[PDB]
Amino acid sequence: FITYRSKKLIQESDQHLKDVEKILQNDKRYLVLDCVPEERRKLIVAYVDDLDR
Amino acid sequence: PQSDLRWSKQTDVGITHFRSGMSHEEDQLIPNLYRYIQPWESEFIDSQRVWAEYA
Amino acid sequence: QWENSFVSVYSKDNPNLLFNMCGFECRILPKCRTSYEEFTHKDGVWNLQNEVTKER
Fold first, then answer.
1. Interface mutation vs chain C, best among A24, A26, A28, most C CBs within 10 Å
2. Count of beta carbons in the 10 Å neighbourhood of residue B49
3. How many C-beta atoms surround the C-beta of residue B22 within 10 A?
4. Alpha-carbon gap, residue C30 to C36, rounded angstroms
5. Is A49 in contact with A7 (CB distance < 8 Å)?
6. How far apart are CA A50 and CA A52, in angstroms?
7. Cys-Cys link to A9, which of A16, A43, C17, C40 (CB 3.0-4.6 A)?
8. Rounded to 5, what percent of chain A is helix, strand, coil?
9. For A22, nearest residue in chain B (alpha carbons)
């Protein structure tokens, strides 16, 4: 997200989520937020909306 | 210094003086080369992310 | 030669732990075992994650 093009990648398509997951593959919070799949989906949606807001 | 960015050109109307962008704060010519190296932490992380994709 | 060598002990009393490789010095200390002040004048902090546990 340091690059200003992160917002453009987010607005492009769902591939930005894959890019963030590849860069953030070691997200310990991703494993903490993984037990609740609906919670992880809501968190990802809220992050995408805040980035695209 | 902001007083070392003055220029003008006498083309059609006269010597139109101008100045670069220094209204925010002082001019930081070399803020830090550390920002334009991608240090060994970023290097190792990007390698762990990139060599796997290469394979 | 001891005048050219350097030891670095670690126990309940010596939480610091020094290194001096061929390049720059280094000092490691835990993140959940009563860490030091952690000054961090620059943005140099190596979050050495656990290989198996994946924790700082």
1. A28
2. 14
3. 13
4. 8
5. no
6. 5
7. A16
8. 70, 0, 30
9. B49
